[PDB]
Amino acid sequence: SQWSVDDVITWCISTLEVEETDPLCQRLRENDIVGDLLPELCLQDCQDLCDGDLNKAIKFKILINKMRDS
């Protein structure tokens, strides 16, 4: 995939309809996770990534599988 972090943020915005200031984005950038890495992140990574928002985490994970496969 090899996306730049900015593009990864862009994906999250476009897909979750969240802001860059959203906790998902904060944790994602903080943990220094990149889009290419995204398929590798598990639901628990995602739970950390959303800062404990399960709804966020589940939706984001599903989007990642779509992001990769489709």
> Long-range pairs for 45-54 at CB < 8 Å and ≥24 separation?
49/24, 50/23, 50/24, 51/23, 51/24, 51/26, 51/27, 53/23, 53/24
What approach was used to elucidate this structure? NMR
Query: Which amino acid makes up residue 34?
Result: V
Query: 3-class DSSP state for residue 30?
Result: helix
Which overall architecture, per CATH, does domain 1-70 show? Orthogonal Bundle (1.10)
Number of helices and strands (H, E) in the chain?
4, 0
The domains of the chain are located at 1-70
End-to-end CA distance of the chain: 12
